Scaffold this active site. Structure first.
Site, PDB file in Angstrom:
ATOM      1  N   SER A  57       0.823  -1.205   0.000  1.00  0.00           N
ATOM      2  CA  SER A  57       0.000   0.000   0.000  1.00  0.00           C
ATOM      3  C   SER A  57       0.856   1.254   0.000  1.00  0.00           C
ATOM      4  CB  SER A  57      -0.915  -0.010   1.222  1.00  0.00           C
ATOM      5  OG  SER A  57      -1.767   1.112   1.215  1.00  0.00           O
TER       6      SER A  57
ATOM      7  N   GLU B  15      -8.908  -5.225  -4.935  1.00  0.00           N
ATOM      8  CA  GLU B  15      -8.291  -4.182  -4.116  1.00  0.00           C
ATOM      9  C   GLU B  15      -9.263  -3.296  -3.336  1.00  0.00           C
ATOM     10  OE1 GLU B  15      -5.506  -4.254  -3.228  1.00  0.00           O
ATOM     11  OE2 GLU B  15      -4.098  -4.987  -4.737  1.00  0.00           O
TER      12      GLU B  15
ATOM     13  N   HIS C 263      -7.719  -5.874  -0.146  1.00  0.00           N
ATOM     14  CA  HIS C 263      -6.523  -5.113   0.145  1.00  0.00           C
ATOM     15  C   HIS C 263      -5.889  -5.734   1.394  1.00  0.00           C
ATOM     16  CE1 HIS C 263      -3.952  -1.690  -0.523  1.00  0.00           C
ATOM     17  NE2 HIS C 263      -4.059  -1.308   0.737  1.00  0.00           N
TER      18      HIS C 263
END
Ligand SMILES: C[C@H]1C=CC2=CCC[C@H](O)[C@@H]2[C@H]1CC[C@H]1C[C@@H](O)CC(=O)O1
Ligand SMILES: C[C@H]1C=CC2=CCC[C@H](O)[C@@H]2[C@H]1CC[C@H]1C[C@@H](O)CC(=O)O1
Ligand SMILES: CC(=O)N[C@H]1[C@H]([C@H](O)[C@H](O)CO)O[C@@](O)(C(=O)O)C[C@@H]1O
Ligand SMILES: CC(=O)N[C@H]1[C@H]([C@H](O)[C@H](O)CO)O[C@@](O)(C(=O)O)C[C@@H]1O
Ligand SMILES: CC(=O)N[C@H]1[C@H]([C@H](O)[C@H](O)CO)O[C@@](O)(C(=O)O)C[C@@H]1O
Ligand SMILES: *[C@@H]1O[C@H](CO)[C@@H](O)[C@H](O)[C@H]1NC(C)=O
Ligand SMILES: *[C@@H]1O[C@H](CO)[C@@H](O)[C@H](O)[C@H]1NC(C)=O
Ligand SMILES: *[C@@H]1O[C@H](CO)[C@@H](O)[C@H](O)[C@H]1NC(C)=O
Lengths: 532, 532, 532
Positions: free
Chosen positions: B201, B334, B447
């Site tokens: 990230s 995601e 994610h």
């Protein structure tokens, strides 16, 4: 008379001439000469930095401030210890890293007189340099007397036990003042090559510490410890200091998240805030109730790994450090009046019993560090003489007087001796007329009593009998002689035996005569009891 | 035996041993090693400075504080990402430039193992190193694992757009830790000649930025980006930052006369004031009302002329730099749950429609940055499939996820490939069994999902199925292999093709195999649409 | 047509082009170019430091802030002296070490035009550089005009008499800007080898001080003092300044224990607090009640030992410094209105008498410094004229004008002349049309009146007549001819004799012609009377 003006690295200094009864050459005096940059703002809790140079002529003619301390407590000790006629009141300030100079030399020509740098006592919590006038000493023994000041309390000894605030700032100030002497004293008729460091009590402990610090190596050539050494655990904080640091932070109102945070926060507080905290802590007074081991200690010398690579007990067992002539000495009744009184010691009755004795000594743990399971054996060996409740109180004071000053001192001297270095000891036993009225006339050789004879109070004060006047002259000779040759002897003076195997030491007083084996029994008894 | 003690350049550190199932040699763990001077006081909003050396043995045994952030949001992201059995709660502090070390080597002898430095995500606003436990990865792949922390939010990204406060303090902290590693990682059994940097990230974004910065040149030899890169606009502010700086200065209660004035003022605020200022800006949550394009910024990576000399968009299509093998990857979904759940995205219906879509997608500007005149064309492309109000909601998510990770990631990969440096890509499609309850089961490759496999959660947490255990052993080998040679391939693993002209990549999951042209279709569509 | 862009030592600056009435070559204008680091936090009361280099192009297109001062008084002076059509509102900030550039050179080709640096006036308490627009002078005489700023009042002149705060920060700021001109001006089409410094009133005093300062040698080649020199006592506090410091310290509410203590406390105060302290002081207003001598003057130029090594008086008697062409001048009615107004001088009834005069004079002590025992003789000299009580007021305003400007000014020129360097003097006798309405039309050549001609107000403001326009052009030629050759003379201009032994000076106004022995009689009187 045109004011004495001396040229120093950082610039010129202007002083005043003062003549002393019976001396042709007036002594040149200088007050408040800066030897370091003011430890303010971000400089708090860090090593002292060089002083900023000055453009014109600086008037070193005003007693400098005494480092922030308990003003009440501070002024009192100044009065009791001062040697001048009138006591000089002083102001507080973080801006206190100054030193006073008393040179008898004729600045008009070259001179290399031995220099004697004095470090005042006050348990690292209070005290000032201006308390001691080096007028008599300078004129009477032709030496350059330098009185230095250093950071006290939180300002000079706060330590997180890590690299964020190692501690010992006060001590670093001493070493900083010594370098200044080395680079400038020649301009005042001094010999940077013959510097002697001498102090009393905490100052005695300081000289003891410096004699051990690699940071001082080559900064002095002879040392005198008056009633105070490094083995004197009270002033040396061994073990993890972190807990005491956090305690202070909280009292001042700071988070204890990390060391770095505590320090940053304490740097944020104002002088007034740290002083209030300094007072809530009641560091100078003894806590009667509570647990002997809990009763918050205080803050002082630590093993930072800079000034001290390890505890003094250890260091002294290492004959691989640079050595110099060393004079160590104590007074007859170290715990006679002064100290107990200033600590508010519980002695209202003036008498005692085997019980209370074992109770007072236990509570006195933060001073004599004696395990409760040991209390008895100790109480007995001393207070076991007669049944007299009065004779007891007195022996009890001896008990303590041997733990804090007696035993430590002799031990230090022994090790120094064994280390192969020139060693001298003495036991001062006299009662100056300049004592406080509230002092029982039976107390002789109390804590600090030798100060008046060393700094010649007789030639600045009034009422000194011929006996006293000559006792002082005698002492200054000894001290000055030592300063000159690392040997107190001189023509016209009693012979002072060197402290070797015979353990010959000098008893000073009405009748100054040599003796041997100082506190020998005492050192013996305690070396054992403590080994449990 | 005895706790591990390593001698680093700044002093000795003391760690602790921890054994792991199936491994003879215990792993030596070190927590809280300082790699910089605490950025406090005047040091705020300025480049990180070297840590001060310590005199004894420092205990690197406590988890260090995490840099100031929303305490609430921080704990939440930690619990969701942590690969360990029980989440470790942390303390907030400005004193947070620390790192943790997990070495599997036998420190009693020389060892040069590959080194992998982990950079945690959290939108440059939240996150901590301690969240990620390296015990498993180090034991299973025989590599040293280093987790680092860097300043976040205002503290690490505040920028006036000029020399009075360039910005990117956080990235500088990262570069700082890489230098610490280059100078010390050998004392822990690492090989400074083979350091691999990886992050997820915001952390993946950080790795990307470092790959483009001259400042990081020669500090690492390989790089992996897990769901996040440089082109990922949202974390890279462009245009004039002055306005946002002022918006921040005013909120904190400061003047705004000149940049220097603003910085000087924020430098004076307290952690809590800046923390409360941070909480007011509500950087994390998405504002639903008012004009979209106006909705409040977030600060982040900027083109300071020191870390980045121009936009990533410019640096990639250009310079003849010092390249290194680069691994870039994304997950299957995601924007499937974790992110929308944390931004409080308005999807309580479980359904959406062509209209509401375009409404949302326009308000989502501060996340996708798509012109309102483009919306219909874009919205139609994805949601124009069927009329199902559910299939829409989902396809809408693929929309978002493609604009934020998918397309940017592949462009970067291509650009790197074309630059002529090894390049690898992957797509993680698997639903860990350590996912949160509130997470629908229809989501796969959300994610942060590949994080449990990368840091071997199956070996710390409980209940992992043999299949999940295997997926982890696999991923780790691949990562480690890449960290050793810069090629994931090795015996006992499916062949992972290079991301060359054929655009081959690895599909990782319960059934791992190679594929081609990841997101190829989307990249194309979005390249034209964005070209107005 | 495109924004100008010049590269300086610390970065690129972007300015704007501006065209004056009939000039084909536009003038490039840069506003707010920093020549030092913002003097904030610890940098307060310390010499100015170099500016931090910027990375991209810095937009020099906004009037910088004027240094902290009385906003009322500051706005007022700027409105009274500005030569631009509309007055520009300014902002206050400690962040003010900037300068503005007005260059008529073609930046595309090399160009080394003469440089004219302007130092604004305002009693060292108020004023700003932006007040003076350099467009007309730059275009009309083909020179580069540089207007600089410098710290005022407390921020720029607080001195403790010692190294902790020497003083003259403001003068050091001027020296810094001059150094900035030397290293950059060429980039702006200016010749660093031909820089001329000129200022008015306090700015005139500064020019006079730079002329005697060893530090500034080589930073200029010609100097112009307009109504103000270093002998103009009122601005140079001789003697011990320590008291005025303690007074400011206390008023700001700071302990006065030691200089370092004071300096440290004032550095901790906010800009706003120091301004309030500045208002409480009440500097710019002459006090009527109280002791004339005790009525504190101000605080300004001191003898620091770095910029000035001795009082201006002692320095002039030393022809052993660097000498350059120096033009000095006064105005017919220096104390005719502006000054007596801004200070609220008690002269409403428009008349005076011998008694009220002697008494007024004594009260004005902190302005003309006249021993009380001298007053009668002095007042009998100027007012001994007619019995016309109105003439006495005017003659009294001459009395003061003479002691504050006329006499000091001539003595300087003479001393300069005798030292062997080109000297030139003048007397401005004209009443600009841009005068305030509240100014009696009978006041001609009032303080600051020449400013309008020097900076060409007639070509930026409206109302000027053909005669005023002609005057301005004339003056600008003279000033620029001086900047060019250290000789004001030029084809098409009345002859301006050199101030040699004949003491020729130029009378400027409607009818400009040469003359001799300016103030000759007055200097004899005051030199003689002042001999005590
Ligand atoms: C009420 C909300 C919270 C928990 C849920 C759990 C299971 C069913 C559904 O999943 C809901 C969602 C609503 C639909 C949306 C919310 C988005 O944040 C992520 C998503 O994929 O589903
Ligand atoms: C009443 C008083 C105050 C304000 C004025 C304003 C405009 C006209 C005139 O100017 C008067 C004066 C009277 C003449 C005085 C003014 C002093 O400022 C210096 C002077 O030359 O005489
Ligand atoms: C601050 C102050 O006013 N006290 C005196 C200080 C002292 O140096 C320091 O206080 C240390 O004593 O500076 C002077 O000595 C000086 O240089 O002229 C004069 C001044 O009276
Ligand atoms: C307050 C706290 O818990 N931190 C501890 C740190 C940490 O390990 C990191 O060095 C910095 O956070 O180190 C100590 O434990 C230690 O070396 O003895 C002291 C300190 O108490
Ligand atoms: C320092 C500062 O922040 N002030 C202004 C600066 C000026 O250079 C200085 O104020 C001096 O004039 O100009 C800007 O517009 C610029 O683009 O740099 C920013 C801002 O408006
Ligand atoms: C310093 O002392 C001299 C001599 O006593 C005196 O003339 C002078 O005024 C003093 N200067 C200061 C700093 O007060
Ligand atoms: C570090 O941990 C050790 C245990 O090995 C402990 O003895 C020591 O006290 C700790 N550090 C400090 C100085 O607190
Ligand atoms: C600086 O000037 C340029 C053009 O002259 C302009 O585009 C830019 O926005 C300016 N800087 C600022 C205030 O952002």
């Amino acid at each position: 008379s045109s004011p004495p003006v001396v040229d120093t690295v950082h610039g010129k200094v202007l002083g005043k001439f003062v003549s002393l009864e019976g001396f042709a050459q007036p002594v040149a005096i200088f007050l408040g000469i800066p030897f370091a940059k003011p430890p303010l703002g971000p400089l708090r809790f860090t090593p002292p930095q060089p002083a900023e140079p000055w453009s014109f002529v600086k008037n070193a003619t005003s007693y400098p401030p005494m480092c922030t301390q308990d003003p009440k407590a501070g002024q009192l000790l100044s009065e009791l210890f001062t040697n001048r006629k009138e006591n000089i009141p002083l102001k507080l300030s973080e801006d206190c890293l100054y030193l006073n100079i008393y040179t008898p030399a004729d600045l008009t020509k070259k001179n290399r007189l031995p220099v004697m740098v004095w470090i005042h006592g006050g348990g690292l919590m209070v005290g000032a340099a201006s308390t001691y006038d080096g007028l008599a000493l300078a004129a009477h023994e032709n030496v350059v007397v330098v009185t230095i000041q250093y950071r006290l309390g939180i300002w000079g000894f706060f330590s997180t036990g890590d690299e964020h605030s190692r501690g010992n700032w006060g001590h670093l100030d001493q070493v900083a003042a010594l370098r200044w002497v080395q680079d400038n004293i020649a301009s005042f008729g001094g010999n940077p090559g013959s510097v002697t460091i001498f102090g009393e009590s905490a100052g005695g402990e300081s000289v003891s510490v410096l004699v051990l610090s690699p940071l001082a190596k080559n900064l002095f050539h002879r040392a005198i410890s008056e009633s105070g050494v490094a083995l004197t655990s009270v002033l040396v904080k061994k073990g993890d200091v972190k807990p005491l640091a956090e305690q202070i932070a909280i009292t001042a109102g700071c988070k204890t998240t990390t060391s770095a945070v505590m320090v940053h926060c304490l740097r944020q507080k104002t002088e007034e805030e740290l002083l209030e905290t300094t007072l809530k802590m009641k560091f100078l007074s003894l806590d009667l109730q509570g647990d002997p081991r809990e009763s918050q200690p205080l803050l002082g010398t630590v093993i930072d790994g800079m000034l001290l690579l390890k505890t003094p007990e250890e260091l002294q067992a290492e004959r691989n450090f640079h050595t110099v002539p060393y004079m160590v000495g104590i007074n007859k009744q170290e715990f006679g009046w002064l100290i107990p009184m200033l600590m508010s010691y519980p002695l209202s009755e003036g008498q005692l019993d085997q019980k209370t004795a074992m109770s007072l000594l236990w509570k006195s743990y933060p001073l004599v560090c004696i395990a409760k399971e040991l209390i008895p054996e100790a109480t007995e060996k001393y207070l076991g003489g007669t049944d007299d409740t009065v004779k007891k109180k007195d022996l009890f004071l001896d008990l303590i007087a041997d733990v804090m000053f007696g035993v430590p001192s002799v031990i230090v001297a022994r090790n120094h001796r064994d280390a192969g270095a020139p060693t001298y000891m003495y036991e001062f036993q006299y009662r100056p007329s300049f004592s406080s009225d509230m002092k029982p006339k039976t107390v002789i050789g109390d804590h600090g009593d030798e100060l008046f004879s060393v700094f010649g109070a007789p030639f600045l004060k009034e009422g000194a009998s011929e006996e006293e006047i000559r006792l002082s002259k005698m002492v200054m000779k000894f001290w000055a002689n030592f300063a000159r040759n690392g040997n107190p002897n001189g023509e016209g003076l009693p012979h002072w035996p060197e402290y070797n195997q015979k353990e010959g030491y000098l008893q000073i007083g009405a009748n100054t005569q040599a003796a041997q084996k100082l506190k020998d029994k005492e050192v013996a008894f305690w070396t054992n009891l403590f080994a449990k």
